[PDB]
Amino acid sequence: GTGCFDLLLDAEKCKYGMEIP
Amino acid sequence: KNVTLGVPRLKELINISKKPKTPSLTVFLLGQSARDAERAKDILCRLE
Amino acid sequence: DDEEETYRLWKIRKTIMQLCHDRGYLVTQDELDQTLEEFKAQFGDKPSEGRPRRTDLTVLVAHNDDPTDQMFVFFPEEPKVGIKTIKVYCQRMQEENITRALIVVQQGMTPSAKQSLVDMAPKYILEQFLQQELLINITEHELVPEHVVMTKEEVTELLARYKLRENQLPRIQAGDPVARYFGIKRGQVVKIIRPSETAGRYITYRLVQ
Amino acid sequence: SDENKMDDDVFLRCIESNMLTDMTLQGIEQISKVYMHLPQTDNKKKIIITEDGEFKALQEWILETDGVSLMRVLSEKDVDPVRTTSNDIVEIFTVLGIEAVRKALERELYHVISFDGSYVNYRHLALLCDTMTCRGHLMAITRHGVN
Amino acid sequence: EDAPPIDLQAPPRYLLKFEQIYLSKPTHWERDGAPSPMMPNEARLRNLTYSAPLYVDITKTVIKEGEEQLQTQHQKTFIGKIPIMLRSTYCLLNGLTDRDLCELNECPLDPGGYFIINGSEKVLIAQEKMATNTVYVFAKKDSKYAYTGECRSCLENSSRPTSTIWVSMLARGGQGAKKSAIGQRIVATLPYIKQEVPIIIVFRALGFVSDRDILEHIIYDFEDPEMMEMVKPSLDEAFVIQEQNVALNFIGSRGAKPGVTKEKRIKYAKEVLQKEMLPHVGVSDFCETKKAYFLGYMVHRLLLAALGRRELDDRDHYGNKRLDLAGPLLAFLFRGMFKNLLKEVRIYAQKFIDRGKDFNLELAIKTRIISDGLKYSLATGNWGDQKKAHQARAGVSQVLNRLTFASTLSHLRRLNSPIGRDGKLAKPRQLHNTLWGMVCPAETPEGHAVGLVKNLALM
Amino acid sequence: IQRRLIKSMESVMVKYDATVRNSINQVVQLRYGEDGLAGESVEFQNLATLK
Amino acid sequence: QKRITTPYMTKYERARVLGTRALQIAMCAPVMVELEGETDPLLIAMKELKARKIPIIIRRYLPDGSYEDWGVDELIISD
Amino acid sequence: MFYHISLEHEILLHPRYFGPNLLNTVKQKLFTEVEGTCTGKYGFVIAVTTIDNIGAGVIQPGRGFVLYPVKYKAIVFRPFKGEVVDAVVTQVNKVGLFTEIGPMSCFISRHSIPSEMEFDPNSNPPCYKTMDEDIVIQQDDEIRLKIVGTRVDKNDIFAIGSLMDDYLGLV
Amino acid sequence: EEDASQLIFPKEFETAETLLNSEVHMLLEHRKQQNESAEDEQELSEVFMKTLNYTARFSRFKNRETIASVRSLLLQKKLHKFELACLANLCPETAEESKALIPSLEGRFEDEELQQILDDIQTKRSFQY
C-alpha cells in the first residue's frame, strides 16, 4: 500500500530557507 | 646442592610457572665411567 | 668436529630407523641395533668433508600390513630449509607415488617454509623433526610409558564397551613429542599401558585433538 | 683482511667484553654448576637384578646440575638416556611429552611429601596429576579457590 | 618564621608577615567565650579535644604607590589551636606534685604522653623512615642498573619537601656497539628530570668546565688506578658537552616542563640544580663548590661499593633509619594547614584587593583549618589532609590501650616499621642485631603483622 | 593451596561405571586409583614372592 | 549515479512529496520560495515543486533490496 | 568503569528545524538526548567526544517526524559485576556506609562490612570505626570496595558493594 | 551472568578501549571547554559535573605525557585492556595487592615481573605536594 518508496530528508538542500514568522 | 622443597616447591608444581626457583637436573651415568670418579669429571666439564 | 658428527648422525639414523619400527613399518633387524662401529664401515668414509652425506642417508621402508604404503625419511643437507627445497622433495616423492615422508630439519627452519606443511594437499603428509629431538629416543625413556596406536576398528569397539564419546576421553596435543614420534593426527586414539604402582598395569586411552 | 667508527682501539674494548661474557668454550648454556657425588640413598643408586636373584644396588656416580637442559643434556655421550630425569615439569613437557610429566609430577609431588616423612596414598596423588594433564597440556590448578 | 612573604597585587601592594607565635595554656571556650581552664579529665568526660589556643602576631605593610609606607600591629591574632600532649611543657599537669594530680581526678602513676581527641586517647605511633642527608649504596638484581646511589637530602627541620636523587651505575649485562666498549657508566637522575642524565654533565652545569676538576672531586687518590678506570667511561658520554651553558641546556632539555625558548632551558636547569638538587648542602646561589663536593662524594661512595672495597649499606640497619615521633610527625602536618592558611588568606584577599578596598584580617585567617586539620587525622588516623588527592598513611594515632597499665606503657613506646618501597625491599619482620638495647627483641604482635610493630627498649 | 586444590577437583567423582569423571563428564581415570578400590580399606603389606 | 529508474516522477511520489511537505509547512517549516500571500499550505508546497526547491529526497526501494536516491528537483515533473 | 564506544541513537527532529544547516540542529540535539542520561545497558553517558557520522533522515509516515540515525563517540560508566573500584563516602548511617562511585551512588550494607567495624553514632562526623581504631571510614573518604551486584531502576543503575574481600578498606 | 573477576561481560564492550580516570578528565575538560564558550547551550548535566570531580580527585597523573608513558609501557605487555585501566586507576602498591584485587592478573603474571610494572607506575604518578 504505497510503501515501495520512502521520503528522506536532506540537509544540504535545507541549507537555504527563511522561516515565515 | 640446594633443592627448594616444601611450600615453595609445592606452589611451583601446581603453579606451572616457566621459571622455577632452583630447577635442578639429575644426570645418571652409564658404563665404565659410571663407577670411576675421574672418568666422570670430563662429563662434568662438558656439561657445565 | 668430524668425530662428533659421526656420533650425532649415527644416533639420528638409529633413532629414525626405530621410529619406523615403532610406527608399524617393516624394519630390518640389523638396522635397529646397528652399531656405531658399523656406521663408519658401511659408509666407508667420514661424513663431514667426505663422500658420506645426508642426501644418501635417506632410507626406504614399507608398511608391514601392506607393502605399497612406503615411507620416506629425507635430509635437507643445508643449514636452513627453504620453500624451494621443500617443493623439490614432495615433487621428487611424486614419482614414487608415496603418501608419507619424513624431513629431518636442522636446528633452523625458515618460517615461510613452515607454511609449506600447512598448505599441502590432504594426501600430502610431511612431518618436521628437529635434529636435536631425534638424537634421543623418547619412547625408551622410563618416564614415557608404552604407546600403542589404536586402529579405527578398536576405537569404535572401545567406545561401545565404555559408552564414551570423543570429548570425554583424555586429550593429548598433536604437537606432543610422543605424538610427533608416532606421526598421529587428530581423531586418533593412543593406548597407553603404563606400569601403575597400585594395580601393576593400567591401560589409558587418549584422543589427539 | 678487515684491517685493509671504532677502527681497532674502541672495537677491541667492545669485542673484549663480548668474549668474556657470552663465549662458551665448552658446556651447555643455562648450566651454572654441576654437583657430582656418590649417592648414599637407595633410590638414586641403580638397582639391577643379580645372577643369584636377590636385589643389589651398585654404586653409580650421579651429576646433579643446576638449571634445565634436558633436551641437550640427554643427547650427550656417556649419559644415560633412560634414568636421566629432571625436576622441572615444564622442561619435561617440551622434551618427553605430557605423559612423561604425569610420572615426573608424581615423583616431585611424592618427593616433597615424603621429605618430612609423611605419606599419602598414590591414588590421591595420581588423581591430581591426571586432572592437570587430562586436556593434553599442563594446566595450572584453578586459581579462584572459592571453595 | 620561615613562611614565605604574602604578596597581593591586581598599585596597592600588601605584604603580610608573621612576627611571633604566642601559646597559652589550655582553656575551654563555651557560648560565653570566657577563657576558663580546661582540665584534661574534663575533655574525656565531655568528649572534646584537649587542646590549647594558638596565637600569632601579624604585621602588614601597605603601599598605595603614594610613597608613604604605613603598617598596623595585630596583637595575638586567633590563628587557631594546637592539641597538647598530656604531661608536656604546655600541659596543665607539668611539674605538679602527686597530691595535686589526685585533686584533678588524674592518676599520678599515669605517665601521659598522649592526645585526647573527641574524648578518645590517641598515641602517635612512631614511624621509622630512612635517614636523610645520608649516602646509601644498595644492590638490586631487578633494576636495569647494577648499583643504586640513593641519597635522600633535606635541609634542617623541614624547609622544603624531601628530595631524593639516585646516582645509579648501569650494569654490564647490556651489550652494544659503543656500550660494550665503554662498558659501565654512571647515570644520575635529577628529581625534576624524567630521564637519567650522566653525572659528569651535572658537574659541568655547576661550573667545573675542566674535566680534571671533575676527577679531582670524585677521585681523591690519583695514585690508585682502579677507581680511575671506572670513571673513564662516564666521561665519554659527557665529553661532547664541554661548555657549562651546554650542560645547563642539556639538563633542561628533558625537564618536566621544558621552556619554549632556548634561554629558558638554562634557567630551569639552573634552578633545579641550585634549589631542587641537594637542598641540604646549599640553598643559596653561591654554593656551587659545596654542592659539587657532596655530589663527587656520592660518586666516590659508589666507586668503593662497585669495586667491593666498601661493604654495601645494610637495609635493616637502624642507624640508616630515623624514628618520627609526635613532634616530627605533627611538624609535617602543621605545614599542611599553614600552607593552606596562606592560600585561604590570599584567595579571600584576591577578590578584595582587585576591588581596591582593604580586607580585614579577622575574616582572612581561618581557624577551622588549623583546628579541624590537626583534629581530623589525630582522630581518624588517616595522616594528612583528606581534600588532597592522595592516600593517607593509616595506623597512626591509634586509641590508647587502657586494658592494663603494662599495655598502656607498651603502646606509648610502640614502634612501626617503614611502609612502602623502603619497608617492602627490606625485611623489617626479621630481627636484626642493631635492636640490642634499643628495641625489645621478644616483644612483637603475633599474626601476619609480625615484627612490623615493636616496642622501644626500656633504657 | 587447600582451597585451590578442592576447586579443581570438587566436581571429580566416581560414577556408576567405576570411572572417574568431572562435571563435564570427561573421563579423568578409567578406574579410581587405577585399581578401583577405596583408599581407606587398603592395608599395607609386603608380598614375599619378589625379594 | 548508475540510476536505472525512470527520470520522470510518478503521480504517487508527487502526491506524497507535496503532502509531506505541506504537513511540514504547517509545522512552522521554512519555505525556500518567496511567499506572495499563499496561506493554504498545499499551495506553498505546490509552487516549491514547480521551482524545484523541495529538500525531500526520494529513496526508491528496488525489489532486489537496492535503493536509489532521486531528488525531486532532478526528477522531471509534469505541469 | 570508563570505556570508549560507538553508539547508535535515532534522533527525532521536528519539522520546525528544517531550516538552514539543520545538521547543526541535529548535531546539537545529540548533545542533549544522549548527553547527561543513563542508559540501563551501557551505563551513564558522562560525556560525548565527537560525532562519527549522521545517517540519512527517514521521514516516519503519518507522524511527520524525520528520524536521523547518527553514530557518535562517547564515554560511558558501566559498573561490571564483581569489580573492585575506589569509591567516595557521601554519608554514613546505621544501615551501612553510603559510597559514591563517580556519577552513581553505591550502598554498602552493614553485614557486608567486616564484623570488627562498629558504627559510632555520636562521633562527629559519623564513621564506621573498629574497636582497635586502626582503620576508620569518614565522609568523603577514599575506600576500595567490590560491587557484588548491580540493579537498574528508573533509568538509573544502583550498585551494591562489599568489603569482606581482602585488601578492601581505606587502603 | 557477567563477572569482572572472571573476565566475562557483554561482547559489545570487547571492541571498546578502556580509559584512565585522569585521562577521562582531559576528555571531559575538552567537552567542558567547547560547551562553555564554543557554543551557547544549556549548562552541562549534573552527571557530567559529578564524574568530573571523581576523575579530578582520583587523577593519578598530571599531564598527557605521564598518561601516555604509562599507557605505552603497559601496552608492550600482554595486559588485557580491562586490566589496563583497572591497574592504573587502582595503582596497587605491590604485586601482591594487585593480584588479590585483580584475580585475572595472577593467571598470566608472575610475582616478580608484575612488581617491576607497578613500581614503574609509582614513578610516573605524582603528588600535588
Residue numbers in the entry:
A (entry chain A): 1467 to 1487
B (entry chain M): 1115 to 1162
C (entry chain Q): 2 to 210
D (entry chain M): 1264 to 1267, 1278 to 1420
E (entry chain N): 60 to 69, 81 to 529
F (entry chain M): 860 to 910
G (entry chain F): 49 to 127
H (entry chain G): 1 to 171
Task: Copy the relevant paper text.
Eukaryotic gene transcription is carried out by three RNA polymerases: Pol I, Pol II and Pol III. Here we present the cryo-electron microscopy (cryo-EM) structure of a mammalian Pol II dimer at 3.5 Å resolution. The structure differs from the Pol I dimer and reveals that one Pol II copy uses its RPB4-RPB7 stalk to penetrate the active centre cleft of the other copy, and vice versa, giving rise to a molecular handshake. The Pol II dimer is incompatible with nucleic acid binding as required for transcription and may represent an inactive storage form of the polymerase.
The dimer is formed through a handshake-like interaction between the stalk of one Pol II copy and the active centre cleft of the other copy. In our dataset, we could also classify two more distinct states of the Pol II dimer that display a rotation of one Pol II copy with respect to another, leading to slightly different locations of the C2 axis. There was no cryo-EM density for the clamp domains in any of our reconstructions and no significant protein degradation was observed for either RPB1 or RPB2 by SDS-PAGE, indicating that the clamp is mobile. The structure of the Pol II dimer is incompatible with transcription activity.
